[PDB]
């Protein structure tokens, strides 16, 4: 007897309430619900209307600047699950600056399959620090509760008692409360999400959130898997086909949809893999009659023609339209603003594209760790470049460290150049490897790739200093290395030893007390060369140390600056530019003296 | 009876000693003395020869890698003054890595008119910390005693006693000693440099260093001013003419020199202003007969044709060849390596050039504070540019703050662009003023002038925050300002107040404890707007404070980032990028929401 209602399309509700209660006869919404700006409503016409028949929303629910909305307790009293088929800027439940919302009161909300929550800028909102956000969301890293009244004043929340279980999330039982008259059902964890009928009884796997009987896929409010004829079922049995991730429809439904969109005006709703997919995927075509996407001879690739040849990617909502196509007829300006590692969603959506007929621009995308998103990118053309005729733009991606893995990834950049200036944690070795593998057709000129202000956050001196002698007895640590000399021995200022008191085995690169040691004597003979080393003062018995040494050298513009760094080994137990300027002055005068004194035969 | 000898040209002495004692008959040297590399000499053939007739050297004295030179006590026992007409890399006395030099022993050396000393890399040199360097050099800022034996071991110097006056240079009498058998004559300071004959007796102004009699310009070893017929005299009386800054010659001498160089092969030695100048200056020409540079009709400018159209300037020796000419037929790559402000010499030599038919490149010239050197530069052509077609290159001039004063300086850069990337202490306002005044003919493209990594060392927010209310009684400091709002009020993170305990009235820009204050409320009405201010905690009575406030805002690429900074006023008495990223994320989501919700008529 589940879902006693029709199936509602996505809705925009602006201005007044008549459409909001056009939502009376609605047990499920196939689109998005947007209760948008309403100004002439006051907290007295929000009491009579109520919609207890709404069970789930397929895409998301957005509420933005509606006055008089005291609570959602009566508006959505039976909202069980909000799926994440289509998001709104990688958020499945957005609550913006709308005011007069004293409490959330979604006591029947139990899970959100995909997405996050961005309740923010609510000036009069309480009962927010006790909401679960642990049993409703399984991906809690983008939750963005910031600017509500709970962070400005003290509300002094109460909660129904005698008596509703608090749970430990930081180390103490506080509350898991929804409102002044309701709490949220938490049930034994032996079942992840199968339904619990007010006692300890996990229902069948084919039930999501809530159930009313013992194991009975046909008796529960929502289906985790596909829904068919009043029963929650696995992959649709024949002759039923999948539809929009939650229904099992019959062939006639897709026929009617195709006939309606083929002439009236549309997401043709073709059948590929027992799913009534809007469009045939890459490598398949629609012929006639039976709705099937047969494989095409002379491989046919799916293209995503851009609006005007340019696209900015900032969330998963914008990246979801670039799904299923392998050729991009435009350019990508991916720009991930924020402090979250949006990698899985971009890989799933923006991963099948192989040809970009434009420029791959990377703007100020913070928290972007790698470019493995385009794991099938083999060709970046250059038909439509940018100003300066660059084909690969790369602004200050602060957390960018490693580009495409050049051991198993191809590339054929054609008719364009590169642009790598201000990426802090990147290193020039990766850029040069990209140059060698891709074979750039533009041969970028000077200062296109910044030589020095492009790797000064991670040590990639691309050389190793093997330790030779270690002897630690009670208080002295003795070090001996293999001496290293750059092509010009006068550029080596010395070695900068690092050591830190740490008995723990997970130590990374740069607390970290620094010492300076003078370079050895250039004996120019196969002698000991003094094996620079150092003898640190200060030690207590039975401790572990972490040490790694970096070489300090002068900068050379017309060369990749040399360097060396030993691996971080562990001992078991027992005025920075003035010196560079002075060394450069010494070198300059010595070179001038040699040039003046030493001249060839007149 | 002064100068009982001939006049020696400049000399190079390599290999062996026969030319060194070709210097027997020599009371003055008109050029440079270079005792260069000698290898087959040992410390036993340096005893018999001595040159007590050498009184002064006109240009400089260079000693480089000669072995067995135990001391200069016998080699140059009468060297009184070394002038600075022509230097060797802005040094008038160079002593390089030559070894076996136990002591300097130039006890008769008393003054160096122009230049410095660079005694360095002497592995066995003592008696160096007691040399005057206060009465010999009047320009002690480039002296470069660094790598001698006195800084590696302890020599334990002795000094002739009973008895030779030490003088205070750091706060204590130590020594002013020359060697184990000689000290240096210091005499009363009532006369700067006029000669003192072993007692308190300042000789005539026309005597330099040493004199033997009472005031008698005709009786002293050296002349401060010009020398004429055995007497030290002022500007040469007629019919005598100046010659090489130290002689008074007669007309026949310049006739003979001109006749010798006009046919045999040469610094034509023409007469302009009673000086036998090698070449006529700008605006004058040589006609015939009488050696005179009459003014030329149809103004004739003097040009300095470069060797191959390119020149690197690194000291005063290289800049001295560009003296007296107004048009440069090449390019300048001025590159001042070091920590000294070489400004007066460059202004005197490299100051009359008006047209540079090339590119003005500025390489890694540290300690360069301004570009007022070319005070007569009105035209930088573009006939011969560099790679990238730049006409004004500017690399990381760390101490560059202020370019040509654009209130009284012209410029006509033609056929070229600009290049301002990594000048730390420079500011974008000066570059844009240069653009407005010069009127660049190239219209440089994007990223030619770095927008952001070009002013992050000096506060030039080009705005003022006038203080409104100040009230300090015993412990509280209250501040009220006029509120400042950028074009987008969401970019203002707040104000960063600075205060430092300082009862002294000379306080400059950025110890300096930092506090953060939240921005006020955007009332959008002519209200108080909360007048942000702050109330610092901690104060003791009867002290002075220095305070100045800077505004923290997000960076905007397609705009000169706004800002404000109050003037440094004095009170009389009584995780930095994560926040920026979060603010940018807030702005990005709000903009996306406004764009999606607000659409025009379909």
């Amino acid at each position: 007897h589940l879902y006693p209602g029709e199936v509602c399309p996505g809705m925009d509700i602006r201005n007044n309430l008549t459409r909001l209660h056009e939502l009376e006869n609605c047990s499920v919404i196939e689109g998005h619900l947007q209760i948008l700006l309403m100004f002439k409503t006051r907290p007295e016409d929000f009491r009579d209307l109520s919609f207890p028949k709404l069970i789930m929303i397929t895409d998301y629910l957005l509420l933005f600047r509606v006055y008089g909305l005291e609570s959602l307790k009566d508006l959505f009293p039976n909202l069980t699950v909000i799926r994440g088929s289509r998001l709104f800027f990688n958020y499945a439940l957005v609550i913006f600056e709308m005011v007069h919302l004293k409490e959330l009161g979604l006591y029947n909300l139990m899970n959100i399959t995909r997405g996050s929550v961005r309740i923010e800028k609510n000036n009069e909102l309480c009962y927010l620090a006790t909401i679960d956000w642990s049993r409703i969301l399984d991906s809690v890293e983008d939750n963005y509760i910031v600017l509500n009244k709970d962070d400005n004043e003290e509300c002094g929340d109460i909660c129904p008692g005698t008596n509703c279980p608090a749970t430990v999330i930081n180390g103490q039982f506080v509350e898991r409360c929804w409102t002044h008259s309701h709490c949220q059902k938490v049930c034994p964890t032996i079942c992840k999400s199968h339904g619990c009928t007010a006692e300890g009884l996990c229902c069948h796997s084919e039930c999501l959130g809530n159930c009313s009987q013992p194991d009975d896929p046909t008796k529960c409010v929502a289906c985790r898997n596909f829904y068919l004829d009043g029963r929650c079922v696995e992959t649709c049995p024949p002759p039923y086909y999948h539809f929009q991730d939650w229904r099992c429809v019959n062939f006639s439904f897709c026929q009617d949809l195709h006939h309606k969109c083929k002439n009236s005006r549309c997401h043709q709703y073709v059948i590929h893999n027992n799913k009534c997919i809007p469009e045939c995927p890459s490598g398949y075509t629609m012929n006639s009659s039976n709705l099937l996407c047969t494989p095409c001879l002379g491989p046919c690739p799916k293209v995503c023609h851009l609006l005007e040849g340019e696209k900015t990617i900032d969330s998963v909502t914008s990246a979801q339209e670039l799904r299923g196509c392998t050729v991009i007829n435009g350019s990508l300006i991916i720009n991930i603003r924020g402090g979250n590692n949006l990698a899985a969603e971009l890989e799933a959506n923006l991963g099948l594209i192989e040809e970009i007929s434009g420029y791959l621009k990377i703007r100020r995308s913070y928290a972007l760790v790698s470019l493995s998103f385009f794991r099938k990118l083999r060709l970046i053309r250059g038909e439509t470049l940018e100003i300066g005729n660059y084909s690969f733009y790369a602004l200050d991606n602060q957390n960018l460290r490693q580009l495409w893995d050049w051991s198993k990834h191809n590339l054929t950049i054609t008719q364009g150049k590169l642009f790598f200036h201000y990426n802090p944690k990147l290193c020039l070795s990766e850029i040069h490897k990209m140059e060698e593998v891709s074979g750039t057709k533009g041969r970028q000129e000077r200062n296109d790739i910044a030589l020095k202000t492009n790797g000064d956050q991670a040590s990639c001196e691309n050389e190793l200093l093997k330790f030779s002698y270690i002897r630690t007895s009670f208080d002295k640590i003795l070090l001996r290395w293999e001496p290293y000399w750059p092509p010009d021995f006068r550029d080596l200022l010395g070695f900068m030893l690092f050591y830190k008191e740490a008995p723990y085995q997970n130590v990374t690169e740069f607390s970290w007390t620094v010492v300076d040691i003078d370079p050895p004597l250039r004996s120019n003979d196969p002698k000991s060369q003094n094996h620079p080393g150092w003898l640190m003062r200060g030690l207590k018995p039975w401790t572990q140390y972490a040490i790694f040494v970096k070489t300090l050298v002068t900068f050379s513009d017309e060369r990749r600056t040399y360097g060396a760094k030993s691996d971080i080994i562990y001992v078991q137990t027992d005025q920075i530019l003035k010196e560079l300027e002075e060394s450069s002055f010494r070198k300059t005068f010595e070179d001038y003296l040699h040039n003046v004194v030493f001249v060839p035969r007149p | 009876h002064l100068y009982p000898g001939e006049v020696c040209p400049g000399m190079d002495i390599r290999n062996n000693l026969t030319r060194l004692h070709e210097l027997e008959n020599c009371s003055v040297i008109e050029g440079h003395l270079q005792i260069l590399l000698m290898f087959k000499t040992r410390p036993e053939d340096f005893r018999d020869l001595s040159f007590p007739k050498l009184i002064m050297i006109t240009d400089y004295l260079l000693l480089f890698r000669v072995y067995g030179l135990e001391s200069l006590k016998d080699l140059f026992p009468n060297l009184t003054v070394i002038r600075g007409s022509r230097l060797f890399f802005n040094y008038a006395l160079v002593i390089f890595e030559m070894v076996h030099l136990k002591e300097l022993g130039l006890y008769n050396l008393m003054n160096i008119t122009r230049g410095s000393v660079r005694i360095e890399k002497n592995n066995e040199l003592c008696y160096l910390a007691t040399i005057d360097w206060s009465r010999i050099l009047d320009s002690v800022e480039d002296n470069y005693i660094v790598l001698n034996k006195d800084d590696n071991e302890e020599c334990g110097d002795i000094c002739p006693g009973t008895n030779c006056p030490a003088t205070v240079i750091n706060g204590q009498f130590v020594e002013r000693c020359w060697t184990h058998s000689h000290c240096q004559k210091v005499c009363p300071t009532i006369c700067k440099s006029h000669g003192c004959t072993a007692e308190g007796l300042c000789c005539h102004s026309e005597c330099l260093g040493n004199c033997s009699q009472p005031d008698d310009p005709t009786k002293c070893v050296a002349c401060r001013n010009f020398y004429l017929d055995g007497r030290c005299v002022e500007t040469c009386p007629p019919p005598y003419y100046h010659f090489q800054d130290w002689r008074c010659v007669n007309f026949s001498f310049c006739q003979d020199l001109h006749h010798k160089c006009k046919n045999s092969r040469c610094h034509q030695y023409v007469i302009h202003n009673n000086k036998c100048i090698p070449e006529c200056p700008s605006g004058y020409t040589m006609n015939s007969s009488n050696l005179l540079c009459t003014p030329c009709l149809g103004p004739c400018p003097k040009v300095c044709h470069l060797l191959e159209g390119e020149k690197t300037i690194d000291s005063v020796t290289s800049a001295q060849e560009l003296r007296g000419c107004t048009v440069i037929n090449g390019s300048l790559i001025i590159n001042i390596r070091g920590g000294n402000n070489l400004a007066a010499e460059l202004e005197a030599n490299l100051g009359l050039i008006e047209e540079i038919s090339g590119y003005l490149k500025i390489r890694r010239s540290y300690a360069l504070v301004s570009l007022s050197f070319f005070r007569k530069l009105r035209l930088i052509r573009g006939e011969t540019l560099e790679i990238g077609n730049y006409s004004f290159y500017a690399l990381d001039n760390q101490n560059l703050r202020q370019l040509w004063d654009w209130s009284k300086h012209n410029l006509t850069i033609t056929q070229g662009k600009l290049f301002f990337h990594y000048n730390p202490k420079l500011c974008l306002s000066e570059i844009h003023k240069m653009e407005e005044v010069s009127g660049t003919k190239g219209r440089q493209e994007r990223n030619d002038i770095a927008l952001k990594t070009n002013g992050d060392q000096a506060s030039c927010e080009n705005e003022l925050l006038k203080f409104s209310y100040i009230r300090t009684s015993f412990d509280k400091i209250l501040l009220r300002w006029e509120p400042y709002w950028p074009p987008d009020f969401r970019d203002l993170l707040g104000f960063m107040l600075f205060y430092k305990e300082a009862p002294y009235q000379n306080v400059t820009e950025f110890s300096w404890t930092v506090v953060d204050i939240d921005p006020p409320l955007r009332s959008n009405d002519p209200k108080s707007q909360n007048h942000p201010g702050w109330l610092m905690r901690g104060l003791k009575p009867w002290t002075q404070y220095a305070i100045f406030v800077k505004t923290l805002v997000t960076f905007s690429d397609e705009r000169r980032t706004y800002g404000a900074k109050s003037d440094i006023i004095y009170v009389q008495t009584d995780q930095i990028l994560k926040e920026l990223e979060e603010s940018s994320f807030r702005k990005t989501f709000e903009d996306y929401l406004h764009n999606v919700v607000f659409v025009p008529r379909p």
């Binding site: 092509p487 010009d488 070179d591 040699h594 040039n595 004194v597 030493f598 001249v599 060839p600 035969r601 007149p602 | 390599r14 290999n15 590399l37 290898f39």
Partner: peptide
């Protein structure tokens, strides 16, 4: 430019024999 020729690049025996004038 001997520093130019024997430090940034590689200079052979003949070029050093050429620069021998500076010591002789």
């Amino acid at each position: 430019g001997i520093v130019e020729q024997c430090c940034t690049s590689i200079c052979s025996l003949y070029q050093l024999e050429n620069y021998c004038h500076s010591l002789q």
